[PDB]
């Protein structure tokens, strides 16, 4: 009985069903070409869209031109841009590469 | 309790009054025949010059052999128990604790001879001081936790007793019991080759020095025949000693000590002597 009891008090603190109602399914939206902007926050804001939820950064990563498809955007964005970008920190110099922009 | 062995030698007082020589003659008649009897001697005598003047009464007055059934003897039970005669007048408070052990003829009889040499014994009046080797003769001499104590070993036909006897003042009695059970329990696990020797030697010492003088020799011969048979295995003793090894002891004492039911008997001012279920919970280390 101890083991169950102990997990119980501790499993309470673990997490909540409400914050668990986060983890975006949406994503979906939107911008256009430049913008950026393109952020929200929401501790997440699958993707989905598709798939995706990989990463680039926070605040509409959102994908790398959505692998040339859509993104928001689709890289470049407005000053500086989406991936390369730079848009690193204030704002230079290494951009969003990496290499493949993935 | 509940066997003929459980009784006083002299018996309760009332029998002393009622006892009539009828029973005696009966008791005389029963138990004094041979093979029961044994003659012995030591001195300038050799053998022959005895055996001729052994001979004629008693050849003899018999000393008979018929039956008297056989042999009125029967194993006895071991009752883990306690008794306290609590009397607060007297200055000091005796204690005796004991656990049951094997009989005369048995291999383990030697191993245990040695252990009770190692734990050793202390008394008020020794010239030992605080430098003695016996771990209970160093501690209980330091603070005089107990005035004196000795370990006894008694072996009956099929049965034997192991335990100590210690005197101490009433405020002090607890602290003996703990420090005692320290010893028995550090033996049954943590014992050591080196310390064995100082035990082993003393036994060789006492065994031999016990044989000085006419009578102590003869006295031994008497009981031996009734006991081990003819055997007087003097040099063999030594040969039996070298049996003793570290793994010998800790396999022997693991039997009779660790996790048993002791027998406690005490005589007032016992009062602080712990309640029983402490002692039983003090026989077996939990590894503390």
């Amino acid at each position: 009985a101890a083991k169950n009891v102990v997990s119980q008090f501790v499993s309470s603190m673990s997490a909540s069903a409400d914050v668990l109602a986060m983890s975006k399914i949406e994503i979906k939206l939107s911008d256009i070409p430049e913008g950026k902007n393109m952020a929200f926050k929401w501790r997440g804001k699958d993707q989905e869209a598709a798939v995706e939820v990989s990463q680039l950064r926070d605040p509409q990563h959102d994908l790398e031109r959505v692998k040339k498809p859509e993104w928001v955007i689709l890289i470049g964005v407005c000053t500086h841009l989406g991936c390369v970008p730079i848009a690193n920190a204030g704002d230079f110099g290494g951009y969003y590469c990496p290499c493949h922009g993935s | 309790q509940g066997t003929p062995l459980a009784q006083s030698v002299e018996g309760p007082s009332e029998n002393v009054r009622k006892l009539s020589r009828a029973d005696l003659t009966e008791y005389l008649s029963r138990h004094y025949k041979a093979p029961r009897m044994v003659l012995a001697a030591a001195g300038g005598l050799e053998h022959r010059q005895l055996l001729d003047l052994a001979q004629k009464h008693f050849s003899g007055l018999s000393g008979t052999y018929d039956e008297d059934a056989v042999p009125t003897l029967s194993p006895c039970r071991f009752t883990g128990s306690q008794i306290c005669h609590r009397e607060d007048g007297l200055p000091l408070a005796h204690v005796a604790i004991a656990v049951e052990g094997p009989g005369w003829a048995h291999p383990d009889n030697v191993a245990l001879q040695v252990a009770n040499a190692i734990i050793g014994h202390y008394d008020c009046t020794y010239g030992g001081g605080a430098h003695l080797s016996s771990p209970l003769a160093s501690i209980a001499a330091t603070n005089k936790l107990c005035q004196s104590f000795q370990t006894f070993n008694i072996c009956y036909a099929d049965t034997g007793l192991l335990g100590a006897h210690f005197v101490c003042d009433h405020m002090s009695i607890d602290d003996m019991m703990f420090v005692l059970q320290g010893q028995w329990m550090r033996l049954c696990t943590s014992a050591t080759e080196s310390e064995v020797l100082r035990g082993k030697n003393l036994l060789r010492n006492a065994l031999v020095s016990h044989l000085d003088g006419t009578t102590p020799v003869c006295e031994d011969i008497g009981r031996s025949l009734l006991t081990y048979g003819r055997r007087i295995p003097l040099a063999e003793w030594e040969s039996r000693i070298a049996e003793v090894d570290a793994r010998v002891v800790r396999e022997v004492c693991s039997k009779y000590f660790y996790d048993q039911c002791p027998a406690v008997a005490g005589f007032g001012p016992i009062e602080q002597l712990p309640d029983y279920n402490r002692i039983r919970s003090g026989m077996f280390w939990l590894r503390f």
Binding site: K3 | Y258, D259, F284, W285, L286, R287
Partner: protein, 62 residues
């Protein structure tokens, strides 16, 4: 004569206080794995068709 199941058991396990502790752990270990599984069926066998576990079969994967 052979020693009764206890007489063995006591010598093998409950003597050494380590084992006497260890046996307890593994005991509760297997215990909860079997014990909990039985308790469900008994309960579940009481309520039939009252739980999606049975009910969900009507509509699940269409």
């Amino acid at each position: 004569v052979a020693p009764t199941l206890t007489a063995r058991l006591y010598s093998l396990l409950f003597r050494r206080t380590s084992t006497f502790a260890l046996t307890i752990v593994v005991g509760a270990l297997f215990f909860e794995r079997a014990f909990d599984q039985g308790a469900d069926a008994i309960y579940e066998h009481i309520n039939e068709g009252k739980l999606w576990k049975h009910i969900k079969h009507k509509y699940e994967n269409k």
